[PDB]
Amino acid sequence: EDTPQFKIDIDQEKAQALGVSINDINTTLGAAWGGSYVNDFIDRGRVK
Amino acid sequence: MPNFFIDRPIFAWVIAIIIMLAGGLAILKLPVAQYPTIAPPAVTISASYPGADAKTVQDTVTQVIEQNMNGIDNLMYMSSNSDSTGTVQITLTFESGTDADIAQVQVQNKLQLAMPLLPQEVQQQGVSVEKSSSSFLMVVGVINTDGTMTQEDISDYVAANMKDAISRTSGVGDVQLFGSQYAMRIWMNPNELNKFQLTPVDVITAIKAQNAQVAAGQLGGTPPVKGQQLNASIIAQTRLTSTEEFGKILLKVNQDGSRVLLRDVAKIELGGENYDIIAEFNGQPASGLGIKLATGANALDTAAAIRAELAKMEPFFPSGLKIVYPYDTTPFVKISIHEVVKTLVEAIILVFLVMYLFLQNFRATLIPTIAVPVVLLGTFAVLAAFGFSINTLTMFGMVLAIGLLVDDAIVVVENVERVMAEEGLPPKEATRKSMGQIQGALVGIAMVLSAVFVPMAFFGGSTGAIYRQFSITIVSAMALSVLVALILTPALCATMLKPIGFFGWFNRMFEKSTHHYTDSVGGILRSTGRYLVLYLIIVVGMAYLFVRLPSSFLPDEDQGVFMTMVQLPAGATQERTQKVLNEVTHYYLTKEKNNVESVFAVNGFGFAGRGQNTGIAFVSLKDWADRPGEENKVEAITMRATRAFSQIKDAMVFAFNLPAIVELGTATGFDFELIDQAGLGHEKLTQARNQLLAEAAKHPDMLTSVRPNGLEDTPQFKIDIDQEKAQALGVSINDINTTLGAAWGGSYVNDFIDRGRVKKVYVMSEAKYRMLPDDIGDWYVRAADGQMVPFSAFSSSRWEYGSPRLERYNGLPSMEILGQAAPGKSTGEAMELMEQLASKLPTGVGYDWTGMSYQERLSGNQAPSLYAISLIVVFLCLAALYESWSIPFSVMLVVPLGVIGALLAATFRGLTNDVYFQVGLLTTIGLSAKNAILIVEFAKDLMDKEGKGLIEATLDAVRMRLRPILMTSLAFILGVMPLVISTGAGSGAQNAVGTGVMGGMVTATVLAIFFVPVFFVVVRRRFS
Amino acid sequence: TDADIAQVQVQNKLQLAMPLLPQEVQQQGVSVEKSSSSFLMVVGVINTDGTMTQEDISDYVAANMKDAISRTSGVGDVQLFGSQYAMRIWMNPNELNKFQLTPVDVITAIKAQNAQVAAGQLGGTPPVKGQQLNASIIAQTRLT
Amino acid sequence: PGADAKTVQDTVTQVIEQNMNGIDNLMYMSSNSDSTGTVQITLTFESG
Amino acid sequence: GIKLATGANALDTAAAIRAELAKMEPFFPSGLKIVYPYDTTPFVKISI
Amino acid sequence: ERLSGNQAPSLYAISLIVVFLCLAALYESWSIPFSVMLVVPLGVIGAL
Amino acid sequence: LGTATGFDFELIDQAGLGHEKLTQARNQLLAEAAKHPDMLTSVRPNGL
Ligand SMILES: CCCCCCCCCCCC
Ligand SMILES: CCCCCCCCCCCC
């Protein structure tokens, strides 16, 4: 069934007024509230 | 076997009913198409690199893809062309019989491993691998008579809703669009860029950054804290939708504080993805839709369903938008099928009439009218079993086999009736003995005709697929006819037959003619020796006619539509080619009002390569009912159009008719590839091509109209960037190149979403700022600091010649030559002459044969070997039938008698030696051989069983075989007479079949009745 | 089992891992081949005049007679006993240090000045009304 | 990832389903677009 | 070194390779010649 | 299930036709298979 | 095919032991196999 959703409105002009790029804004929003797969590592001989 | 079914009529009826039910089910479940798959499977890779010339496209895409096209099974060859529009077109042709699905997926998976090597723009545009099939079914057209919306608006309307509904029709799911949907066009302006110290790179970066989808996770997502109760998704910034939203995109903020938007610096609109193609329809804008046909689908049903779906969609259309059909030959297929079925039913009716005319027995006249349809339905069932379809070739094979079916059904009943008359026996015993006399002859005939028809389905190459249809159709028809004449016809004769004033006179005159014929045959057996010389003269004349008759592939016929190609000189623009395409459509809609129904004029899509100086206008004529006379046919219209277009000299306009198969044609023509194999270069290969063309022009007796299938070098504007001067001024190379390409070639940056459909976003200079070399002075590129260095400072301009279309064959640079053999000489020695001429070229230049000359070269010698095998097997079957090694020669000497008549008929009517003529010739010689088999079998049976003398036996044999031969010949001539006299509505095939068949049958019937007796007598006396 | 379906399935699964590989691996080229372990044959090429070296012969073989052999029906794999030509740039640490340059600077300059760039057209569509000439614009080409 | 069902449907599902035509022996085709961004299209072919 | 694809025929493939080399030979530079230091097909032909 | 319900009458008709034709062919009469086909409804009502 | 007396053993690192433990196990197995010359001939590791 239909679900409520949370919407974030980002004002581009208000962001560039303060000196923050939209790219790192999107990166910090996505990486904080959602997962951010960075790269791999080796745990016990397996790539995770 | 016939004895078994005479005692069991119910079993024969059950077998006939089973055959009829199977045939009816097959007819209800057989795909229908105009032609089957003939060309070998081909897979085409298309790539787009917008803004690049032929050489950049080649070096960056074509070579990279070709060097990775290895490890693919059954590859015959590959050939690519790179166009100056930024298009890669690579066609890989495979062996015949290889399923194209596995070949296409192999090509796709082999290309997908070369994608990381391609430029980012080529990957971003996409590389499409698709099967080059000839399933082209119809061309829907959507026009705008109201004149409100442009071609782009029609194209977007077609793509948005009509395309999806059409692609879900019962039938095909593959469709193509003669246009492109909307795209957000940002037309920059160099003056505003210079005023605000901006560059197209800044615009591209701003558009990329401020129109994108970003992931944002969700609130309450796992792993959650203890006691969490709410879980909602998070929606961050989404893609832009409206033109105004793109207008608000901020490029930079000014020192004082003012805001710079795209609207201040560029014009934002909803344009087309590309403007290279402008489609028209009788002078007004239109958008097309090319519709193919799915495999195993009914063409008629598919077309009807598509038309019904378009009619259903019609009510919810905006103002205007009439659905037109500039190119559609569904009615051609339906008309041809109706003509074939009419020919079959008329043949059955004529069989009824002839049987009642000769045999005044109503019950007997009808035994063949309920037996031939059984064989026809069995043939349909066999075609369904073998996986074939209902197409022109199969139905013409059926109308060719109808004569032999009639031949069998008439012979059986005629001999049964003759036995009933002469012997005076009840129907059961009469048909029992009658079958005894002709049952071994009917089994030998089946074997001989199988031996003469089967070894033509094994021809290699593209034409082998054409011959296989006729071969399998006729051989199945003959096997089923023999089975029916052994099973059902004896039972019908046993049961139905009843024991026994114009018709009286007819009987009297036929008896007098039979007596005169017997006297003549008796006379010519005493004067034997002159007739052998006459037969030798006939053979020599047959050889002369065969070596004199011109050859072809298939008769081009009036399909109701034809094309016109316009080719302006190099460097011509689109508006210059649009004027000529207006001079052409005005002529067609003015000087041909009563014959032309519509003209579809595609601008920029030429025949020898897309561009701006090329175009094609294809013309749909009215129905064949509205075009009476030979002067209203496509052949008589195209010549008039070409004569009228000879006057316009600024372009090269040529009107022509479509071939029978779009994938084939020019049977006398040849395709030649001139390859360089030492890295010589483009210009050395061009010089070699020019030298070879001059040498070919020095041989007018053999090679006619040899031309290069390609484009000559054209001027190009070279911009040379000084690296030291650019670095001194502090301007980066990747900025100069980026601004140049984005301004003059365009740049697809990202996608947006409007009306629930993803569309592209293009940035390009406004038209007025990218038209002339001096417009280069309008563009400034920002240096390392806030400067705006002019292009002029660090660059120089030049004009130099370059190739607008570079083609490669099998991975090496090549040039294409199209040639035609001389009218009086075949295309085999023309290839030899071309090889001899190419052998005298500069070192490092080799050659190759491609397309249909590739098939000829390797698969052009199957026919003599297969015919020799056929003749050997025919000898074996005949010797087995006659229990003698010499008797089959008498049967085999009826071949020139049937060939000479077909040759004479072909020469008299001006016809050529096509596939239809060859299959009709085989049919005629098969029927004549069958008659000879029956006559010789009867004669030798009279010799053996009754101990009669040679002359007496061979005279009684022809006396009792005269009537069936005349009956079957008259029935077959009257059956195929309308095919000879037929004009329009696919009459080329009908004439090509009927003329040859009728001439051969007439001559064979006239000659065999006199030559088989003397042949048998000479064989019996010279030997033994 | 038929090797066609096996190969298409293997490539279908490998296209998932393809984005996860390093860019260098993708540039070199990942290949999926259905063939035997042992060589069907070995075709050697020599020079009787003694002018061509091992490098020249191997480059000629790879450039002119390896691609065509690879497309021969039934040939599942070709191994070149050598390597074709390439622009080898042997950079000197001492002279790089003398001019305060680094290998990354050399790579950047080569990428910049060895490009095959698309510069567009003169009078390309959509053209302004009254356009008369249409010509391609060629800016930069691969070094040769 | 990062697109809800509505913005992923017309983005990927509608453009893939429209090209899923012309395949022989196909009985029906269903699809679903989750809010996570994952999209699943199932084409069920004729038996045999 | 040529390895034949799985399921192919080892003799017609060798014939095709020799045909390709025969086509290649006329355009060789001066002194360049082709030798066959390894071939498993002639043994097959002589055995048959 | 809907497909199976739509083909049962056709299956019955084809089976009856085939049995009738086989009986007529084997017993060399039309009256014998016609009389045999009259007993089929008895078995059918028994199964029902 | 190999020889009739040949075998291709393949020692697997089922756990997350690592390369050193695996090669120690291989060396131990090779030493143990060298103690039965009457049954095992030329037991060698294929790798480097
Ligand atoms: C009666 C002679 C038959 C010999 C051929 C056997 C194969 C045909 C089967 C049909 C019933 C005899
Ligand atoms: C694909 C090859 C098919 C050829 C089949 C030959 C058998 C024909 C038998 C017909 C006898 C009535």
From Swiss-Prot, chain E:
Consequences of knocking out this gene: Loss of susceptibility to contact-dependent growth inhibition (CDI); inhibiting cells still contact the target.
- Annotated coiled-coil positions are none
Cell compartments where the protein resides = Cell inner membrane
Expression is induced as follows: Positively regulated by MarA, Rob and SoxS transcriptional regulators (at protein level).
Query: What does the UniProt function comment say about this protein?
Result: AcrA-AcrB-AcrZ-TolC is a drug efflux protein complex with broad substrate specificity that uses the proton motive force to export substrates.
* Family the UniProt entry places it in: Belongs to the resistance-nodulation-cell division (RND) (TC 2.A.6) family.
> How does this protein assemble?
Homotrimer, with large domains that extend into the periplasm, interacts with AcrA and TolC. AcrA may be required to stably link this protein and TolC. Interacts with AcrZ. Part of the AcrA-AcrB-AcrZ-TolC efflux pump.
Q: What is this protein called?
A: Multidrug efflux pump subunit AcrB
From what organism does this protein derive?
A: Escherichia coli (strain K12)
